[PDB]
A paper describes a structure:
We designed helical heterotrimers with specificity conferred by buried hydrogen bond networks and large aromatic residues to enhance shape complementary packing.
Ten one-arm fusions to DHT03 were tested via tricistronic expression, with two eluting with monodisperse peaks by SEC and forming exclusive ABC heterotrimers by nMS (rows 1 and 2). The designed junctions between the repeat protein arms and the core bundle are recapitulated in the crystal structures and hold the repeat arms rigidly in close to the designed orientations. These structures show that the DHTs can serve as rigid interaction hubs in asymmetric assemblies, which have been more difficult to design than symmetric ones.
Author numbering:
A (entry chain A): 1 to 163, 168 to 202
B (entry chain B): 1 to 77
C (entry chain C): 2 to 77
């Protein structure tokens, strides 16, 4: 009965907000989900619409609507899973740093075409879902984001090598910076793990 | 169980990392030999392409290991 | 000239990540063993692997400074 849930939620949105961009984009999500035959996409649209209902005229609601649009437009199911986990994190704790981390991580994961980035993002999102409202969860989401950025920097390096010594050196520095940041975050996570085990 | 699956995946990724280390050794030797045989502009570009391939494979192995690390942290909490 | 230096930088990065792999696999194995059975001895080895990882981070930072010097020489 998921489609009926989505329809009733859209009706509630229509009742609550008149001639608002959130309402028009919610109707757009409604039609894009009705056209879509994927159950995961239906669940993601449901979650985004419910988040918009809970926080009307909010930055999180607008960004989540646009993220749900970008996720429905993508035909990759792994990206849909990542977006669903991130939107669930946002639904549980909206006014938290984890919400922003998960929103931006899903926004970047929709763009990424690498399967390893999607896998590590799903792992980090499930780790944050396991023990939410903790320092370790924030560190995990930030680590996943830094890994995605490392992949993006490698893509840039390749594309610039195909086609400038100063630009190559600049991109090498920008890669090593985020590499060091990734390993530092990993060491911090390992320290928190050491303290949790003892 | 989940830990058994993670351990199987870890053994497979360790074998893959050993293969990547072999690639690193062979690439270092090849770069040294090509430097001794004659450096060139287009030769430098070819060496760049090979090096980027090796770096890409190594980084993918690293990211798979880090994803398994994240799953393990989620399990232990 | 600069392409040769970039070649050497990438080779150094490869050699460093080769040891990063060993350290990270050691940490993952120690975590799996800790999940299987709680032993106090394993925490010391986890800390040792973490210290090795920190030393590797220091080496990467040294490489970054080496590249920063070349950037200064090229731009100015």
């Amino acid at each position: 009965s998921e489609k009926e849930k989505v329809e009733e939620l859209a009706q509630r949105i229509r009742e609550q907000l008149p001639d608002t961009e959130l309402a028009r984009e919610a109707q757009e999500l409604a039609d894009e989900a009705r056209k879509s035959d994927d159950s995961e996409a239906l669940k993601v649209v449901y979650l985004a619409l419910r988040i918009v209902q809970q926080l009307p005229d909010t930055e999180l609601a607008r960004e989540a609507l646009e993220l749900a649009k970008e996720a429905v437009k993508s035909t990759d199911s792994e990206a849909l899973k990542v977006v669903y986990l991130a939107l669930r994190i946002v639904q549980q704790l909206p006014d938290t740093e984890l919400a922003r981390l998960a929103l931006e991580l899903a926004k970047k994961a929709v763009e990424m075409t690498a399967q390893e980035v999607l896998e590590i993002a799903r792992a980090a999102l499930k780790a944050a879902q396991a023990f939410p409202n903790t320092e370790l969860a924030e560190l995990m989401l930030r680590l996943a984001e830094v890994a995605a950025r490392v992949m993006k920097e490698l893509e840039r390096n390749d594309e610039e090598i195909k086609k400038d010594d100063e630009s190559l050196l600049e991109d090498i520095v920008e890669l090593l910076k985020e590499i060091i940041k990734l390993w530092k975050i990993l060491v911090e996570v390992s320290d928190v793990m050491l303290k949790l085990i003892s | 169980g989940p830990v058994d699956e993670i351990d199987k995946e870890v053994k497979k990724l360790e074998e893959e990392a050993k293969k990547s280390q072999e690639e690193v050794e062979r690439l270092k030797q090849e770069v040294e030999k090509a430097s001794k045989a004659g450096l060139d502009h287009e030769g430098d570009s070819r060496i760049f392409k090979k090096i980027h391939d090796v770096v890409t494979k190594q980084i993918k192995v690293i990211l798979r290991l880090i994803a398994v690390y994240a799953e393990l942290v989620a399990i232990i909490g | 000239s600069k392409q040769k230096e970039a070649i050497k930088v990438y080779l150094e990065l490869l050699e460093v990540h080769s040891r990063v792999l060993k350290a990270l696999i050691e940490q993952i194995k120690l975590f799996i063993e800790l999940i299987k059975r709680p032993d106090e001895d394993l925490a010391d080895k986890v800390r040792k692997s973490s210290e090795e990882l920190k030393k590797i981070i220091k080496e990467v930072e040294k490489i970054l400074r080496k590249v920063d010097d070349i950037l200064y020489k090229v731009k100015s």
